[PDB]
Write a protein that binds this ligand. Sequence first.
Ligand SMILES: [Zn+2]
Ligand SMILES: [Zn+2]
Ligand SMILES: [Zn+2]
Lengths: 310, 310, 310, 310, 310
Amino acid sequence: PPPIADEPLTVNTGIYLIECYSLDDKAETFKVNAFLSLSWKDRRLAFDPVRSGVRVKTYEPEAIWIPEIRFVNVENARDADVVDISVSPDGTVQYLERFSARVLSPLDFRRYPFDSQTLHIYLIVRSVDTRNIVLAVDLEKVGKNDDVFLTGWDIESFTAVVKPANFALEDRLESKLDYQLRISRQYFSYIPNIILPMLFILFISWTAFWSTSYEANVTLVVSTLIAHIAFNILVETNLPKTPYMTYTGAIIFMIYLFYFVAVIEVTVQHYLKVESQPARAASITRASRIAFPVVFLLANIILAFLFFGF
Amino acid sequence: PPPIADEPLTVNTGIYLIECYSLDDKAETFKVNAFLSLSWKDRRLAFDPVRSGVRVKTYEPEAIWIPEIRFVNVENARDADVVDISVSPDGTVQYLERFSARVLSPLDFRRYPFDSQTLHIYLIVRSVDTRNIVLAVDLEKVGKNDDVFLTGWDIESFTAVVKPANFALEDRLESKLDYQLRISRQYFSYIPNIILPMLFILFISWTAFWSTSYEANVTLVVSTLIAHIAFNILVETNLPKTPYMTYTGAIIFMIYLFYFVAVIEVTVQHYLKVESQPARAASITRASRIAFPVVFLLANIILAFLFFGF
Amino acid sequence: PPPIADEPLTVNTGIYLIECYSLDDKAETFKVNAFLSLSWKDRRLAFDPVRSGVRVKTYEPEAIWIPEIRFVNVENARDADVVDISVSPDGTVQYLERFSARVLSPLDFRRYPFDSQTLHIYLIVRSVDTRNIVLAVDLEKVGKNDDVFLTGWDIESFTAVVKPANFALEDRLESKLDYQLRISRQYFSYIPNIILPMLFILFISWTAFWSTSYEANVTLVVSTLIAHIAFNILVETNLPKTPYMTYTGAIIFMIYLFYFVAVIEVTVQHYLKVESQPARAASITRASRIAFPVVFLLANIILAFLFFGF
Amino acid sequence: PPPIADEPLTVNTGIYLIECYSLDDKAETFKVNAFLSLSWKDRRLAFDPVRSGVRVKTYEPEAIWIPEIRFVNVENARDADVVDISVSPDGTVQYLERFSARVLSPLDFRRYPFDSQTLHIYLIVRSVDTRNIVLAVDLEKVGKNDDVFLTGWDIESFTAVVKPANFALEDRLESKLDYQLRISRQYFSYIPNIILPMLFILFISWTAFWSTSYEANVTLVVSTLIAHIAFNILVETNLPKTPYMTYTGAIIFMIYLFYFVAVIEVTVQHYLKVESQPARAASITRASRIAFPVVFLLANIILAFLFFGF
Amino acid sequence: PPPIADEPLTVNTGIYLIECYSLDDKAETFKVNAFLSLSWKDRRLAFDPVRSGVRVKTYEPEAIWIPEIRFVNVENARDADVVDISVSPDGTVQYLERFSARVLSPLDFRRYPFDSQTLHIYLIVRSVDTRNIVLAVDLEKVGKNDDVFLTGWDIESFTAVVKPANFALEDRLESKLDYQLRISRQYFSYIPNIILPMLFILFISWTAFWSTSYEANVTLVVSTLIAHIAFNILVETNLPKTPYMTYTGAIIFMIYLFYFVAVIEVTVQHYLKVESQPARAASITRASRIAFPVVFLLANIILAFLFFGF
Ligand SMILES: [Zn+2]
Ligand SMILES: [Zn+2]
Ligand SMILES: [Zn+2]
C-alpha cells in the first residue's frame, strides 16, 4: 500500500557502523554490523496530536508501508533485525534497523602492503508508480563508533555521496546511494615478518662473492633461494590473482633475478677459475661485490618510485 | 489453481546478473546473485481498467497462481526473495524476484591457465494438465550489469538458447532453458608467480653442465628438483582431479624429465670421469649444453602446438 | 489423518538424480540434488471423475495426508521444496519433490587411487497404527540425467534394492530402502602429478650408486628423501585416517625403505672405503645397482598383486 | 500451560545416535545427529479410550505442553525437527524428535596419538512452579546404530548417568543429565605417516658418527633436523594449545636434543681433529655410536613409561 | 506498548556464561553461549494474587512488552532462544533467554605468548518516550559455570561495571553496560614447540665459531637460518597484523641479527684466513665465541625487561 504522493517521494537514509570486521584480502569482502536509518512522509497516517494518543506513535512493520531498501553488493540477503518505528504527526515516519551483511567491495593491491583502500555500501530502491529517490540524512550517517575495529587497518573516514544515482532498470527506475569507508593498511608487521627477513636471506646469498668454494657457494646461494620461495609463497597466499602487478610482487620478483645472476657469477667464477685465469675471476667476483648491491638499491629506487612516486 | 488454457501455456523468462563471485575451480561451481523475470497470460484475472482500480494491479504471491521455476544445476534450493508482481488487464502477469544460488557448472582445464569457459544456468518447469513451455524474453535477459565482478576472470557474454528443451520426465513433460555465461581466465598472475619462477629453477638445474663438481652438481640439480615439486604441488592444489590432461600438467610433467636426464648426465659425467675417459665426459657435458635447451624448446613447441594449435 | 487401510499400506518411491557433486574423500560424504517420487492409495479422497472437476485433482501438502519419508544417512534435514501433487480418482496419490541433502556414505580406500565405490541413500518410514512398507517404482528410479557430474569420478550405475528392510524400532516398525550409486575413480591425474613424480625422485636417489662422493651422495639421497615426504604428505592430506592400509599408502611407505637401505649403502661404501677395502666397496656399490631396482620392481609385483590380484 | 502436578514431575529422556561425524581435535567439538525421546504424565489430557477415538492420540507440538529441553554444551541452538507425538490414555505423553547439534566436549591429548576419549551431551531443564527432574529411560538410550561412523575413531560405548544433577540456577532449579560417548583413537596411520618417518630421519642424522667429513656431517645432521621440524610442525597443527604436555610432543621434543648433542659431537670431532688429537676424536665418535641410540631407547622407555605406565 | 512510567524505567540485567569457546587470536573474536537475565516493573500487568490464578504468572514474549536489548560488539544478530517469563504481582517481570553470539573483543599481543587479556560484552538499549537505564543484578551475573572451557586460556574472573554509560545516539538516549571477561594465556605449549626449538637452532648456528671449514660453516649457519624462518612464519601465522610490536616478534626479529653477524664472522674468518693473517682469524673467531652468547643473553634481559618489567 505505497504512500499516495504528488511527486517522486524521497526516502531519507543513514548508516551507523557499529562493528567492522573480517576484511578478507583474498575474497575482497568485509563484514559490517550497523544501524540503518530511514524516513519519509506518508501523510496517509498523519494523526491529530491532541485528538488522540501522544507526540509520536509506534508501529510494527506489518502495519505501515515501508520501502524496500536492498543493498547492492552483498553475498546474501542483509541480516537486519528491526529497532523502532515512530510516526510523526505530519505523517513523517521514523525507521531504524540494525543489520549485518558481508559486503563485496574490491581492493587495489597495486601498492600492496602500503595500500590505502576505499570500501562501498550501496542501497538501491526500485519504484512502483510513485518514483523513489533515496538521499542521505547526515545526522544519522555520522555512523562509525569511537570503537570501530577492523584489525590491521587504520580507519580514515565514513562519508556518503549525497547525490543518488537514478537508473532505469527494467521499466522501473531505481535509486542507488554510495556509502564510503576509507581505510589505510597497518603495514608494519609486514616488516619484521616479511620485508626484513626477505632482505637478510638475499644478502647472505651474496656473501658468496667473498668466497671461492663452489660447494659452499651453491650450499650458499641455492640454500637461500629456497628460502625466498618460502616467502614468495607465504605472500602469494594472502593475496588474490591480481591481473595487474603488486608492489611487493614486483620487488619479490625483482629479487628472483639477483639470485640468478648471483648463481651465474659463482658459476662463472668457476669455469673461469678452473680455466687457469683467476686473473679474471677475483676480478669479476671483486666487482660483483659492488655491482649487485648498487643495481639493487638502484632498482628499488627505480621500482619504488615507479609505484608510489607516480 | 493453474490458469485454464486452450494450449501449452508459455511462460516468459529472463535473468539479470547483478553479482558474480566465488568461482571455485576445484569444486566447479560459482555463485550468482541476479533478477529472475517471469510472465504469462492468466486471462483468469483480467480486469476492467476503467470499471475499477488502475492501469496495473499488484498482488502478493499467495493470491496468484505462479509457475514453479526450479533451477536444474544447483547445490540447494535457490535463495530467491521476491521483488514485485504486476498484472496487466489482459490478464498478463509480471513477476520479478532476485535470487542467489550457487551454481554447478563444469570446467575444461585442458588449456588450464589459458582456458576460456562456458557456464550454465537452467530452469526446468514441470507440467500438470496444461503443459508449460518456458521461453526467453530478451529485454529482461540483457542481464549482467556494467559491474559484474568474477575475480581473475574476464567476462565475455551472457546470452541464452531461445529454443527450450521439452523432456518427458515421469509422465509429465518439463521444459528447460539454457542461460550461458562465457568467460576467459586472467592468466597472467600465473606468470611472475608460477610460469617464470618454474622455468628459472629449471635453468639453474642445468647450470651443472658447465660444472664438474659432482657434490655441487647434485647440490645443484637435486636442490632445484625439490623446488619444482614445490610448484607441481602448489598448482595441483588449485585444480581438480581431471581424468584428462591439463596443459600445465603437461609441461609441469615434461619438466620432471629434464631433471632426470639432467641428473643422469651429471651422474655419467662421473662414472665416466672416474673411469679415466674425460675424452667423453667434457664431450657429453659439452653436448648436453645444447641438447637440453633445444629438446625442451622443441618439446614446448611440440607440446604447446598439440594443445592450442589443434 | 493417515489413510484407513485393511493391511500394511505400501508407499511407492523413486529418485531422479538431477545433480551430483562435492564428493569429499576425507569427510566421506557427497551432495545430491534429485527428485523424490512417492505414491499410495488413499481411497479416502477418491473422487467421481464425471460427477465433478477433471481427470486428476491437484492438492497442497497441508490438505492430504502424506507419509513422512526421512533419509537415513544425512547430516541434516534433507532440503526438499515440493513439485506437484496429483490425486487419481481411485484415491491414488501422486507426489513429487526435489530435495538436496548431503549424504553420509563411507568409502574403501583400500585400492585408493584405483578404487571403485558404492554410495547409498536410504529413506526410512515409521508406522503408526497402519504399517508402512515402502517399495521402488522403477519408472521413477531411472533417476540420473544424461548430465550427472561428480568431478573426477566415472559414474557406473544408479539402481535400488527392491525388497525393503522392515525393522522394529521402538515399538513401531519402520521400512527402509537402499538406493545405490556405483562409481569408479578417474585415477589418472594421479599419475603425472603423483605417481610418476614420486618415482623419478626415487631413481635419482639411487643415482648415488654410480657415485663415490659421500657429500654428493648425501646431498643426493637425502635431498630426494625430503621430496618424498613432500608427496607422502600431499597424499596423506586428501585422505582420511584409514584404520586399514591404502594401496598407495603401501607403496608410499615401501618407498621409505629403499631410501633407508640406499642411505645405508652410501654410508657403508664409506666406512668401507675409508677402511682401505674398496675391494668390497665398488663390489657392493656395483651390486646395489641391480639389487635395488629388482627388489623394488619385485616388491611392486608382490605388492600390487596383493591388493588388486586378490 | 504446564501440567498440574502434586510433586516434581519427572521427564523421561533418551538419545539414539543415528550419526556421528566431524570430531575436530583442534576445536574440541563433534557433530551428532540423533533421536531425542521424551515422556511425562500430563494427566490433564487423559482420554477415555472407549468413549472416543483410538488407543493413542496424536498431537502437534502447539497443542500439548512440552518441556523445554535445552542441551548444555552446544555452539548454537540444537537443530531438531520433530518426529511424532503420541498421548497414552493415562495422560502419558510420548515425544520424539531428531536433532543435529555440534557438541562442545573437551579432550585429553596427554597420550595424544594413543588416547582414548570420553565425550558428553547434557540436557538441562529449568523449572517454573512445579519442579522438573529429568531422568533416563534406557530402552530409548541404547542409541547408537550398528552404523555410527566417526572416522579414525573406534567407538567403545554410549551410556548415561541415571542420577541427574539438580542445581539451583537463578531462583529456579534446573535438572541436568550426562550422556556419555566413549571412544579410543585409531592410532595407526600415525605410524607409516608420522612415527616411523620421524625416526628414520633421526637415524640418518647420526649416520654422521661413522663419518669424518664435516661438510657431509653437517650436510647430514643439519639437513635432517630441518625434516624433523617438518614433522614437529605437521603434528603441532592438528592439535590445540595444550597447557599440558602431549606424549608425542614429548618425544618430538626429546628428539630435538639428540640432534643438538649430535651436531655437538660432529662439531667437537672437528675442533678436536684439527687440534692434532684424533686420539680422542675417533674415540668420542666411536663412543657416540653407542651412547646415542642407548640414551634414546632408554629415554623412550623412561618417557613412554612416564605417560602410559603411570 | 512500553510500560507507562513516572521516570527513567530501570531494566535489570545479568549474564551466566554457560559456554566459552573458539577464541580466535587472528580474528580477535570469541564465541559465548550464556543466560541473559532481565527484569523491570511493568505495574501495568500487576495482578491480584488471591483474586485469581497463582503466585507468579507465565507469559509468552508476544503478550508482554519486552525491552530490546541488543549486544553492541557482535558479528550478527545474537542467537537467543527464550527460557521462561514470570510476572510478579507488583507487575515485576522476570525474563530469561539463552543466547549464543560470537563477540568482537580486541586483544593486546604486546606480551604475546605471555599475555593476559580482558574481553567485553555490551548490551545497549535505545529509548522511546520513557528513558531506559539498564543496570546489573549481581545474583544473575555470577555467570560462568564451574565448567567454562576456553582452550589454552586460564580464565580469571567474570564481573561487570555497575554504572552504565548513557549516550545520546540520534535524538534518543541509549544505555550501555560493560560485562568483563578476564583471561591469561596458557603459554607453555609455546616452549617445547616454539621457544626452545627456536633457541636450539640458534646455538647450532654458532657452532660455526669452533669450526674453520667455510663450506660447513655455511652449510651450518645458513641451513639453520632457513629453519628460523620456518618458525618466524609458523608464529606470524597465528597472529594478526599488529600495528605495534609483539614480544616474540621482538626476540624472533632480534634473532635474525645474530645469524647475520654470525654469517658475517664466518665470512670474515675467511677473507681474513685467505689473506695470510690467521693471527686475527682465530682471534676474532675465538672472541665471537663469547661476544655472541653474551650480547644475546644481555639483549634478552634488555628486551625482556623492556616489555614485562615496564
Ligand atoms: Zn524493457
Ligand atoms: Zn663439499
Ligand atoms: Zn509474588
